[PDB]
Write a protein that binds this ligand. Structure first.
Ligand SMILES: Nc1ncnc2c1ncn2[C@@H]1O[C@H](COP(=O)(O)OP(=O)(O)OP(=O)(O)O)[C@@H](O)[C@H]1O
Ligand SMILES: [Mg+2]
Ligand SMILES: [Mg+2]
Ligand SMILES: [Zn+2]
Ligand SMILES: [Zn+2]
Ligand SMILES: [Zn+2]
Lengths: 159, 98, 49, 196, 65, 133, 266, 85, 43, 783, 114
RNA sequence: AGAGG
DNA sequence: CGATCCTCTCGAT
């Protein structure tokens, strides 16, 4: 693998290095191996980075991986967009999936979680646990046919 | 050289719709598939008794022409006997940009 | 120019669409992978025409 | 559409005079755009045209069969025999101005198809009309005089814009909207009203 | 479906050259191109008009009522 | 003013290079041992052969809409063969006092190099180019 | 005679080949447009179908009838019904033709443009007689009938310009070329290895002096001298296509001159 | 209550896309409903174009209540709010 | 019409792909785009 | 899902769409019948009373007319039947449901609506005929083709609903995309093609034409510019009259490859004031490019002003090309005889190279690296030699193509077409692939029964030797067909996949919006981010700018930034400063020049530690380069005179400018620190750009000009900030979603390859979003 | 269905005059004549003739949209020359040019035999 | 179902 | 327990 690294003169230069690409994961045990740089060691198993190095590193590898689908395809999406998603998935302590498992079971609304999946099962658990709908979310106001607190209705006009 | 058989004609690997395309062998793989779905939505004489049938929707070209460019397969599919289009004189040009 | 091959049912022309299935009485062996107690399986779909 | 997966709607109609012309006084019935050939790779379209040109002059059919030995070269050979520039091109003049076009045009016959689905069988417009039985929303289909579906995709599109009011209006004032009576105690739609 | 009157492209009257064209081929034992030309059909837009024409009328007439 | 520069140059190289109507011409002055030239010429209206003696002038005279000439009795500052109108775009100072000019005659480009081209071009988005014989 | 010069090389009953010397492109072209469109002619513009037992649709028949070319000689002494005072049409604005044909013969019965009949009082005008150029005397074949079939209809032929419907074209194709040597460099010939050997040189090359290879390009030269061939359909004779061509163009310029004079008052 | 005082207001002194759009909206709604115009309409007739002129002149008597996540709010005059955009 | 009369439907390992074995039996071009892609075949 | 989230709506339209060279970007051609069906409730005000009374008189079947007069007390007086429709003496307060007339705001769309730009407010222009007409440069954000697309239309019913449309969703507003921080619309098709043709140095236009072209630009000063040529013919350059569509104050600069200040190849770009100086206008200049003429006009001159530009450019270019003309024939596929022999031998040698590796493998001599089979290593070699073959033969074609080659002409403009197209159409199609590997053994030990068993040769395993011009053999044909099918199948797979991914992402981020504290929070009010994008900047207001303190040798860094007034050689001389000599060995000003230098070296390190590889160009608000270039032109910067600034001016000027680049407002600890961080990166840029030496020696700025640069930077920055209420959640979800769904559906073209992605790809992104415990390619890269 | 009547191409409508002469807002001594129910047959011809008048500074025409039979002619003349006149003179010149042509073609036709 | 982009 | 969008047609119980 080629590397952009600074010359003693100061400028950045190509200095090819030996890297090992592995088929299979055991990050924990591999980094404790001598003659390796455990500061640099990487895996496409961002779930394992989350487990070995902590949430913050997990977040990084997740972006590294989200970015990599997008760019190792041709396209460019501004950092912040992919950054927002990664943050959403992260900011909880762990990896929250973009599925009915992850985000849909979250501490959110009620009428807003039935907008996605398991519509009736979400509505029944609401009627069982006697859930209180905040009516803050977009989806809530959509059902209510009221102006949501989005852009234009985010503030309040007065006299 | 150890042959047991010979093809009657490769043109025959194709079916009815593709058998209508001129020089399919000089076309990008899908473009061929497209024209296959397309030619099935093209107007003209579907049968001679059109004037005698009570059917929901019937579209018939006023003066359908036979193609100036034909496949040999077409003969069997009675194309030049019951055509789908007209031999329009077409310019490939940037004109009014319309 | 008509070719037939269709039916007329309650005044409407009906094409009977040729339906594709895998032929029976055929002996086919399959490799069953990783989360499986059986490595390989030899199958036969015996029919009576 | 041409016989090569080349769909296109008529953009405009021009009458003979405004159309570009050959010094023979030949004029097209149709004008396709050069920018629908390189990416499409409909090379046969070009061969078809060239061959049909030869065919019309020679007064013989075109052997557009696939695994032929017929070449662009062999065709082009004949087209030049027929006094035209071999590669389909022709000098044309601008109908408005009468001046020669700086570009020469690949022009000739090409079998084109008149396909079903025409603007007028498609145009629809609605502004209050057949409201659905149960749902109380505009009906489906142009025939029924239905309202167009403003899907979630479209709701999302509007949330992104921050168009809060339009979204509420597009979902209430237009389409649905209703007025129910709620209890200040239990908070349910079981309130009997004598609105007079 | 009967020989159109006038060529779509140019307008030269073609609706009169039909039977005339068929004699040239049948009786006079001529070839298509020469026969087309013999009818004064010089331009290719006029050429196609008659050459690619399929006269289904003959077939429709055939129907009994 | 009036004039802003004057010299006789002898063509070194003549290059069409993927163009028909235009040629990039390379020349030097008969007088100044340092004075260089580079120019895009409409070789269709004024063809230039290899090694041609030609008087090059840069004026600024003969804002406001262009009127068709109509010879009449209106005489412009020319009894020349080739005339152009450009715009100053850079003034590259090199070794010692070696000043190079930069003009675009509607995309056709100039590059006159020398020494004494001081209060003679003064960044003026004007300037006309004149060629003789 | 003073300005623009005409030199007729070939002339026939329905075709004129000539040269147009001492003229501007705009004029040559504008003439070609007015010849295509703007010349009035007579054409069927209303078919009233009593009986139609043919294989063909009523409108399909009506369409062909419109295309049938008919005498447009004394067409300047027939009014545009739009500006005629009658409720609908009359003898001063329309020509009324009739068609009745019945397949009586065991063989196929052919209906020709020859079978149309004027019923309108023409008031001695050379107008609406279906033009027949066909050797055998029959016109355009309109329809065909089996032994059974009948077709009974009435036609109203009216004054109109091609610019409204192509049927009104005294038109047909107009050949048009200027500078067969591209001395003007008014087009850049596409080539593979050689422009000269690949492009076939014009019939009009004989009438001009071939370039000069190692000679300067004529930058000041202006396109003049136009090689033209006007084809008549038959409604109006060839001479009249170009004479009426010149005339109607001359007319619309005059209306624009007269237009100015009306705004001049108030 | 909650109500943040006039002193200490960390929100943008600049009007937001949305505020501009809702202001121009509401004003056009009033003008369209035969309400009074506080600006010398230079032959103007469109309620939004009139609201536009009113905005430029800063003669729109409306106040944006900016809500914060805790529930608190900062009120700003349409006239005090900087209209760059 | 003729084309409709020569149609095939394959309900439900890689059923959509044009198999080598289709040579001379099925048309390689004729197949609808999406949903029924490579399941609806033409002889 | 279908009755609450989505609904069927009234005041809706939809019909076939067509292109319009004579329409304004922001306009929509509305067919007369449609205009006559869709209404708008207009309250009767004295401003409108007369226009409205007239409309009521016109009635439902005349165009500028209405249907229904709704007075007070409900009452819908129906204009089509009412026995009073004839009179009607309107009262104020009453509403009139008038027909949708010219210049009304409408929301126009094209499904799938997987993008904020698939929905845009348009100005009505009622027209004859049945299609919806649109400006060709709005084709891309909607993803429209004129092959039969349908496009829907929605009518706002309230004044506040109309304001929302015109002040937020307007087409000119939506020009600069916040997805890719680059602009979404540009010059396309004929206009792109022609602009190149017109901008040729060889392209010369006469007066007659010039005048028509000039009158064609609707803005036009009504002043004929002086011709470039005043020799035996007043001749204008193409570049010249097109510069009339380019507004003044527009400064643009490029440098492509061989681009010198003389660009002998006529490449790069130079536009000073509002006139092109050199460089052919093509995609890089007038396309959806981040540093294009569009990004510049939209930023510098305004969005409305820029939207107007699209029109002008099209009006001239289109007219010029209507008169120039442009075609494509079979001729543009036929490459040289001598060239065919080269292509032919290129294939021949690749084919022999293949036979050799095969014969070597068959002799049990070919030894694979590690991690892969002798068979595995064999295939990728053969695969490589065969692609290398097609590519080499393809370039052979491309190079041999003349400048008059209509296909080369198109790729040259970047209007349509690519290298591969040339290659395939004229030289060699290439190797066919299914599931990555080249055509497999469907039959026993062969790909077809026309072959013998165990034939690993290029032709047997699906290598197409022939071009589309030459034609394909039945085997080649069927193999091309096999690979072709792959594309069609994966569309019908990936589109149903990517589209689901979209709704999931969209539902997962719906409620994420910037609050009135730059905080990015959800419905529960939980902090997702403390500043949007970690900088509280609006995505639309950001563009890639080079950080010069990050790269280069310490040597070059010194040469550039260092100023030692205490050193005779290494100080700034008095040629470029009024106070120059008066400052040699200042000690007190050397203390400021030194403090400046240390911050400049502090960053150099900091940046090398954040951007580890040493990547200079990063997307940052405020294009400083443009501001500088602007000041230079605005103040007609006399590069020969010294200057009027002091070291104290530049140093404390840049220093104070940074204290005023506000994102957050709080006077407290965390907030002032959050603000301090938010700006860190931009400040590096700012300092790197506005350091003393660089200001004087490089830019050669004046005090008047500098003061303005500071005010411009401050203002631009403030504009560049995120607006509270920005629906950043939906935005991000769509900004990731839209590309995915379109990396397929496209899907294709062609048949070789175009995978990875489909393949890499949507299944991986699926693994990621689903948090797949059991991934397919678990890799570990050890250093 | 939403198409206009083909006579809308040459027939003037409700009120509607042929020429609408409006003063140019920008440059002096210039005017914008809007020709109603007209094309390139008249536009180009008047335009090209105007360009022969060695006292007409500017003369160009445009057909803003193809759907409509209507064209805009811009004329700028030298101080002390009304553009209305420059047009009048141009129009007159064309009629005369065409006059000769009719007379000439007519003459030549009679000499021709077929 | 079938079909359209 | 989920599996892209919208549209348009015919016409089975
Ligand atoms: N199944 C589908 N679901 C959603 N959108 C679709 C679907 N099929 C097509 N589309 C949309 O419409 C377009 C249909 O392809 P289209 O025929 O218009 O364009 P294309 O890829 O450029 O090919 P062509 O060369 O025929 O123009 C897509 O690119 C996409 O936006
Ligand atoms: Mg398309
Ligand atoms: Mg499309
Ligand atoms: Zn209660
Ligand atoms: Zn013809
Ligand atoms: Zn009458």
């Amino acid at each position: 693998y080629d590397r952009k690294v600074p010359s003693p003169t100061g400028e950045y230069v190509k200095e090819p290095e030996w890297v090992l690409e592995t088929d299979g994961v055991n990050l924990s045990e591999v980094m404790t191996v001598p003659g390796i740089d455990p500061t640099r060691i990487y895996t496409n198993s961002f779930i394992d980075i989350m487990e070995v190095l902590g949430i913050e590193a997990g977040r990084a590898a997740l972006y590294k991986e989200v970015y990599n689908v997008i760019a190792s395809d041709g396209s460019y999406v501004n950092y912040r967009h992919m950054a927002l998603l990664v943050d959403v998935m992260t900011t909880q302590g762990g990896l929250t999936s973009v599925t009915r498992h992850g985000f849909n079971r979250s501490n959110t609304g009620a009428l807003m979680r039935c907008s996605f999946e398991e519509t009736v099962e979400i509505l029944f658990e609401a009627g069982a646990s006697a859930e209180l709908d905040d009516c803050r979310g977009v989806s809530e106001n959509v059902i209510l046919g009221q102006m949501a607190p989005i852009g234009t209705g985010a503030f309040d006009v007065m006299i | 050289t150890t042959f047991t058989h010979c093809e009657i004609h490769p043109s025959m690997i194709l079916g009815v719709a593709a058998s209508i395309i001129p020089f399919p062998d000089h076309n990008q793989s899908p473009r061929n598939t497209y024209q296959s779905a397309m030619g099935k939505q093209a107007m003209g004489v579907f049968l001679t008794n059109y004037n005698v049938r009570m059917d929901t929707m019937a579209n018939i070209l006023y003066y359908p022409q036979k193609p100036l460019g034909t496949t040999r397969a077409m003969e069997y599919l009675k194309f030049r006997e019951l055509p789908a289009g007209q031999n329009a004189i077409v310019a490939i040009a940037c004109y009014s940009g319309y | 120019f008509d070719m037939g091959g269709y039916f007329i049912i309650n005044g409407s022309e009906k094409v009977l669409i040729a339906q594709e299935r895998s032929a029976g009485n055929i002996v086919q062996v399959f490799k069953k992978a990783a989360p499986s107690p059986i490595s390989h399986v030899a199958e036969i779909r015996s029919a009576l025409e | 559409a041409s016989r090569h997966g080349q769909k296109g709607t008529i953009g405009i109609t021009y009458r003979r005079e405004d159309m570009p012309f050959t010094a023979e006084g030949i004029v097209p019935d149709l004008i396709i755009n050069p920018h629908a050939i390189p990416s499409r790779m409909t090379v046969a379209h070009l061969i078809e045209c060239l061959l049909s040109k030869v065919a019309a002059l020679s007064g013989n059919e075109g052997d557009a069969s696939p695994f032929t030995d017929i070449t662009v070269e062999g065709i082009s050979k004949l087209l030049r025999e027929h006094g035209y520039q071999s590669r389909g091109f022709e000098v044309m003049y601008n109908g408005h101005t009468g001046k020669k076009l700086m570009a020469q045009i690949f022009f000739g016959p090409t079998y084109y198809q008149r396909l079903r689905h025409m603007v007028d069988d498609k145009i629809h417009a609605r502004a209050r009309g057949p409201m659905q039985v149960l749902t109380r929303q505009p009906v489906e289909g142009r025939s029924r005089d239905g309202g167009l579906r403003f899907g979630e995709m479209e709701r999302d599109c509007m949330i992104a814009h921050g168009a809060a009011s339009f979204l509420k209006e597009r979902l209430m004032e237009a389409s649905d909207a209703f007025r129910v009576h709620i209890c200040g105690i239990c908070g349910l739609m079981t309130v009997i009203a004598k609105l007079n | 479906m009967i020989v159109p009157v006038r060529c779509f492209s140019c307008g030269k009257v073609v609706g009169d050259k039909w039977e005339s064209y068929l004699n040239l081929l049948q009786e006079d034992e001529l070839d298509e191109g020469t026969a087309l030309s013999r009818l004064g059909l010089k331009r290719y837009c006029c050429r196609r008009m008659i050459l690619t024409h399929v006269d289904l009328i003959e077939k429709f007439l055939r129907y009994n009522p | 003013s009036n004039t802003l520069f004057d010299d006789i140059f002898q063509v070194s190289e003549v290059d069409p290079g993927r163009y028909n109507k235009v040629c990039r011409i390379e020349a030097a002055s008969t007088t100044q041992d340092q004075c260089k030239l580079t120019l895009d010429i409409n070789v269709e209206l004024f063809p230039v052969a290899a090694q041609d003696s030609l008087t090059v002038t840069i004026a600024s005279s003969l804002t406001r809409s262009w009127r068709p000439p109509q010879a009449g009795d209106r005489s412009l500052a020319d009894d020349y063969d080739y005339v152009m109108y450009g715009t100053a775009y850079k003034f590259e100072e090199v070794s010692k006092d070696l000043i190079a000019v930069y003009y675009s005659f509607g995309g056709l480009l100039m590059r006159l190099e020398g020494n004494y081209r001081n209060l003679n071009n003064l960044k003026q988005e004007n300037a006309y180019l004149l060629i003789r014989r | 005679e003073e300005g623009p010069q005409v030199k007729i090389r070939e002339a026939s009953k329905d075709n004129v080949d000539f040269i147009l010397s001492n003229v501007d492109l705009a004029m040559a072209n504008s003439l070609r447009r007015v010849m295509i469109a703007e010349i009035p002619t007579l054409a069927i513009d209303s078919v009233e179908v009593e009986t139609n037992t043919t294989v063909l649709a009523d409108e399909f028949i009506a369409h062909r009838l419109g295309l049938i070319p008919l005498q447009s000689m004394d067409i300047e002494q027939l009014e545009y019904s739009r500006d005629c005072f009658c409720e609908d049409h009359c003898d001063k604005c329309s020509v009324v033709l009739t068609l009745q044909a019945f397949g009586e013969s065991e063989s196929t019965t052919n209906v020709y443009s020859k079978d149309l009949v004027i019923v309108s009082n023409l008031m001695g005008r050379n107008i609406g007689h279906p033009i027949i150029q066909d050797k055998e005397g029959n016109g355009v074949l309109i329809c065909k009938l089996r032994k059974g079939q009948e077709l009974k209809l009435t036609c109203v032929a009216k004054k109109g310009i091609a610019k409204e419907h192509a049927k009104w074209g005294p038109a047909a194709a107009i050949e048009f070329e200027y500078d067969p040597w591209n001395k003007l460099k008014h087009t850049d010939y596409w080539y593979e290895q050689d422009s000269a050997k690949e492009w076939p040189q014009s019939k009009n090359c004989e009438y001009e002096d071939p370039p000069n290879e190692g000679d300067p390009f004529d930058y000041k030269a202006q396109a003049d001298t136009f090689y033209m061939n006007v084809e008549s359909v038959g409604s109006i004779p060839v001479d009249q296509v170009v004479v009426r061509g010149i005339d109607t163009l001359q007319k619309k310029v005059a209306s624009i001159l007269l237009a100015l004079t009306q705004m001049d008052q108030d | 209550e909650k109500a943040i005082p006039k002193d200490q207001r960390a929100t943008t002194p600049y009007m937001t896309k949305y505020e501009r759009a809702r202001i121009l909206g509401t004003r056009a709604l009033q003008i369209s409903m035969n309400a009074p115009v506080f600006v010398d309409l230079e032959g103007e007739t469109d309620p939004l174009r009139i609201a536009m002129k009113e905005l430029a002149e800063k003669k729109i008597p409306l106040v944006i209540r900016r809500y914060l996540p805790d529930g608190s709010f900062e009120d700003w005059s349409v006239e005090e709010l900087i209209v760059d955009l | 019409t003729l084309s409709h009369l020569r149609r095939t439907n394959t309900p439900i390992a890689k059923p959509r792909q044009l198999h080598n074995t289709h040579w001379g039996l099925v048309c390689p071009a004729e197949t609808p785009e999406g949903q029924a892609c490579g399941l609806v075949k033409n002889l | 899902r279908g009755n609450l989230m989505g609904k069927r709506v009234d005041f809706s339209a939809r019909t076939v769409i067509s292109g319009d060279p004579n329409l304004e970007l922001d306009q929509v051609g509305v067919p007369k019948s449609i205009a006559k069906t869709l209404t708008y409730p207009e309250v009767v005000t004295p401003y409108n009373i007369d226009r409205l009374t007239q409309l009521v008189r016109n009635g439902p079947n005349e165009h500028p007319g209405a249907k229904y007069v709704i007075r007070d007390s409900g009452d819908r007086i129906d204009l089509r039947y009412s026995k009073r429709a004839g009179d009607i003496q309107l009262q104020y307060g009453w509403k009139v449901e008038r027909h949708i007339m010219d210049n009304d705001p409408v929301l126009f769309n094209r499904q799938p609506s997987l993008h904020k730009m698939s929905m845009m407010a348009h100005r009505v222009k009622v027209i004859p005929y049945s299609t919806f007409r649109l400006n060709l440069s709005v084709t891309s954000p909607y993803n429209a083709d004129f092959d039969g697309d349908e496009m829907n239309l929605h009518v706002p019913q309230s004044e506040e609903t109309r304001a929302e449309l015109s002040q937020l969703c307007a087409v000119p507003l939506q020009i600069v995309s916040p997805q890719s921080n680059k602009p979404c619309m540009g010059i396309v098709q004929d206009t792109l093609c022609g602009i190149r043709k017109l901008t040729l140095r060889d392209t010369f236009i006469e007066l007659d034409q010039v005048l028509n072209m000039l009158y064609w630009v609707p803005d036009w000063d009504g002043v004929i510019p002086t011709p470039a040529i005043i020799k035996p013919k007043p001749l204008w350059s193409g570049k010249q009259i097109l510069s009339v569509a380019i507004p003044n104050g527009i400064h643009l600069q490029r440098f492509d490859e061989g681009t010198t200040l003389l660009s002998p190849k006529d490449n790069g770009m130079l536009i000073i004031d509002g006139q092109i100086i050199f460089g052919v206008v093509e995609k890089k200049t007038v396309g959806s490019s981040n540093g294009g003429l569009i990004h510049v006009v939209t930023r510098e001159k305004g969005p409305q002003v820029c939207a107007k530009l699209f029109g002008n450019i099209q009006k001239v270019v289109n007219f010029w090309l209507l008169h120039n003309g442009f075609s494509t024939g079979i001729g543009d596929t036929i490459a040289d005889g001598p060239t065919m022999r080269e292509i032919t031998e290129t294939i021949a040698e690749a084919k022999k190279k293949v036979l050799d590796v095969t014969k070597e493998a068959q002799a049990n001599l070919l030894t694979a690296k590690h991690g892969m089979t002798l068979r595995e290593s064999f295939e990728d070699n053969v695969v490589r030699f065969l692609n290398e073959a097609r590519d080499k033969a393809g370039r052979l074609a491309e190079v041999n193509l003349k400048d008059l080659n209509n296909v080369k002409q198109m790729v040259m403009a970047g209007s349509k077409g690519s290298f591969i197209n040339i290659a395939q159409m004229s030289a060699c199609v290439g190797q066919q692939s299914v599931e990555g590997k080249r055509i497999a053994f469907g039959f026993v030990d062969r790909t077809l029964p026309h072959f013998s068993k165990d034939d690993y040769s290029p032709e047997s395993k699906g290598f197409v030797e022939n071009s589309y011009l030459r034609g394909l053999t039945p085997q080649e044909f069927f193999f091309h067909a096999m690979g072709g099918r792959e594309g069609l199948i994966d569309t019908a797979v990936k589109t149903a996949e990517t589209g689901y991914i979209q709704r999931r992402l969209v539902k997962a981020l719906e409620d994420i919006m910037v609050h009135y504290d730059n905080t990015t929070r959800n419905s529960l009010g939980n902090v997702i981010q403390f500043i949007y994008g970690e900088d509280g900047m609006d995505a639309a207001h950001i563009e890639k700018q080079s950080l010069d303190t990050i790269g280069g040798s310490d040597a070059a860094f010194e040469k550039r930034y260092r100023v030692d007034l205490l050193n005779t050689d290494h100080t700034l001389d008095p040629s470029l400063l009024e106070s120059g000599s008066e400052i040699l060995g200042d000690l007190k000003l050397q203390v400021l020049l030194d403090e400046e230098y240390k911050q400049l070296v502090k960053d150099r390190k900091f940046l090398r530690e954040v951007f580890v590889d040493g990547e200079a160009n990063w997307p940052l608000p405020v294009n400083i380069r443009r501001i500088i270039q602007n000041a230079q032109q605005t103040f007609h910067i006399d590069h020969t005179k010294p200057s009027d600034l002091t070291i104290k001016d530049i140093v404390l000027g840049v220093k104070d400018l940074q204290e005023n680049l506000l994102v957050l407002r709080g006077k407290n600890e965390i907030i002032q620190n959050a603000q301090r961080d938010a700006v860190t990166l931009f400040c590096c840029l700012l300092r790197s750009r506005l350091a003393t030496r660089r200001v004087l020696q490089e830019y050669r700025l004046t005090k008047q000009a500098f003061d303005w640069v500071l005010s411009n930077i401050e203002a631009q920055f403030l504009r560049s900030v995120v607006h509270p209420g920005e629906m950043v959640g939906v935005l991000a979800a769509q900004s990731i979603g839209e590309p995915a769904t379109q990396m397929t559906l496209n899907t294709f073209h062609f048949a070789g390859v175009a995978s990875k992605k489909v393949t890499s790809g949507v299944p991986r992104l699926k693994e990621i979003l689903n948090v797949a415990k059991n991934m397919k390619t678990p890799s570990l890269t050890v250093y | 269905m939403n198409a206009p009547d083909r006579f809308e191409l040459f027939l003037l409508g409700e009120g509607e005059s042929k020429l609408k002469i409006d003063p140019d807002t920008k440059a002096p001594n210039a005017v914008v004549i809007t020709f109603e129910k007209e094309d390139h047959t008249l536009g180009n011809l008047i335009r090209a003739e105007l360009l022969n008048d060695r006292k007409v500074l500017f003369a160009a025409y445009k057909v803003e949209h193809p759907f409509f039979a209507r064209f805009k002619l811009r004329i700028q003349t030298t101080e002390g020359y009304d553009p209305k006149d420059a047009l009048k003179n141009a129009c007159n010149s064309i009629i005369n040019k065409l006059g000769a042509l009719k007379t000439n073609f007519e003459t030549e036709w009679n000499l021709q035999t077929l």
